[PDB]
Amino acid sequence: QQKLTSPDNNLVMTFQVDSKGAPTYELTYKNKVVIKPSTLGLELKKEDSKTNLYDGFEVKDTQTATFDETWQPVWGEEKEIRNHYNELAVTLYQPMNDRSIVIRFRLFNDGLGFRYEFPQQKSLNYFVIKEEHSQFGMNGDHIAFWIPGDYDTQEYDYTISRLSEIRGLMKEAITPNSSQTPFSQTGVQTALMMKTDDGLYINLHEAALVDYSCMHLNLDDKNMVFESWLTPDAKGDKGYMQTPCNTPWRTIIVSDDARNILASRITLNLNEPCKIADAASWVKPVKYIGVWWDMITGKGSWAYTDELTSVKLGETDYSKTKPNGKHSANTANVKRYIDFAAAHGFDAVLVEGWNEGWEDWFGNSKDYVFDFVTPYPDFDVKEIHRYAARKGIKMMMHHETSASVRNYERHMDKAYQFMADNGYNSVKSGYVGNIIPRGEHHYGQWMNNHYLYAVKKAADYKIMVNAHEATRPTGICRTYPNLIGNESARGTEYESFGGNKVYHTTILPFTRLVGGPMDYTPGIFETHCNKMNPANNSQVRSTIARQLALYVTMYSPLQMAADIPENYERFMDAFQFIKDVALDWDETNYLEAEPGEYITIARKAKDTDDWYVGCTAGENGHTSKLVFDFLTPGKQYIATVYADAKDADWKENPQAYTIKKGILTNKSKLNLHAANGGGYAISIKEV
């Protein structure tokens, strides 16, 4: 029986093979069971007994080791991260099949990572995974913060419930989406966040999801045992493997303090070190606005014309079509966004709908849907480039693929060259629609390869990537820091399609943000969409002050101010926080945190002694008693507090805020109240 303990002695991982030769593990935290005894193994696809990789093992060897080194991300929530764990590697031999695997465990002070490894050997070379069976046995009927297991979308509102209640709530939790394949009445996605009755917080996730199929979790509610459930390919199989090869890591992050789930860097720690040698010379954070919300709300169109029932690139002559009067991506309009961006210190402007083919972007399973290089007649690529460069602005490329992946791959070098030739160095991609090649899912091994292929090719071009609808992140950004964003969760766009749950931004940091930043596109000031488009009665579930908080509480090196310029001009005093807030950080201090209820975070701007605070809250609001001793003794600071009015409310009074400017020091105190769906933001600049 094998014992592994964390450096600080608070965590013990016990490993053994049971009487059937099944590898089993368990985990305790400060003498509380976190993981009850749980098995590990896989079942392989038949080319009989060679399909069994789940029992009949015996321990052939074990090796231990300790590691403790620090490293610096190119961008992140702090300057430096410490990677500190005790390790146990267990070689398991299967006499029936004359073959061996290795399970490697790394135990940190804030949780455990394990992976399977398959050494090259006479009897194990090429193999196909039928299913992975990594178990995670819970010690009680925890409260979980979850979205439905789904091979194709993550764009769901979270549900808060007991594990025993998941089955009953799944049907209503799955709302409509143009591409979705739920797999189980008790299937949920990772990262999955839980709170136990005995005072613990537990996050189940994976890290370094590379050359492998995305892991979801299937709950056995007879048992309270969660199990790995991977994403099948077009024929139903779950990964083509070739030794020597590894599974991604599986992680259990645990603490009695919720804030430490946020502080954990286990995910990034388990990724391969940076493989882009000159990354720091060219990867930079980006604050941006865009021609975007117009089409999202329905006020404007991505399409250039309404007269054609369908289009054929290279055949349709758009210069002969009649403009629909609605097309936001036109030169004069883009120049006004360029104007506003330069006036207020933004880095870039995104434009969507610039390229031929948008008339057919949606729902058609169209192969040759875009070419990523040919502009509409009213989009003057060269003039826009000239103007932007004149204002010190960069244009952000848009590559919606409409989920036609072979087509994107065929065009990708030419699309990236086009970007280089015209002064674009960051791209937002998308994958809306069911995947072509048809029969594949968004999160299968096939597509995971494609998203990383796109990022690796971009890096050779010194291009940064932000990919919507891709597989949700698992820390790969350490290895390839030019992956500066994904959506890969329910974003601000759904505030325009009926709204996100009020508590949504109190959960995402605990689940989605684990593994990588999100391009959440915060900053909507006019929260009633009907003012953009009278047919849309959607209302953003936030106050204005809480939108401000999100620049701090939704970590990302890529931050949009998503409203249209007109609306920012109606509230320029509130806008000042968006202009000031930094995007990269030397320090982060998690002040308060409780999933589903509130999160408060102070971050120190990289290479300054300026700090920025944000608070975001759920349906009950939250009262903060803030202490400022992360501030430097003896220094003075100018602090500007942007808070909810005492009458504020997301629904009935979302635009009510106060702005107060005063002096702070590490002796100061502040009582503040985040309203129902509200929050606050503070800039604290050394004098």
Ligand SMILES: O[C@H]1[C@H](O)[C@@H](O)CN2CC[C@H](O)[C@H]12
């Ligand atoms: O603007 C984006 C949005 O940010 C993506 O999440 C989904 N989209 C599909 C179409 C268009 O690309 C739109």
Ligand SMILES: [Ca+2]
């Ligand atoms: Ca989306």
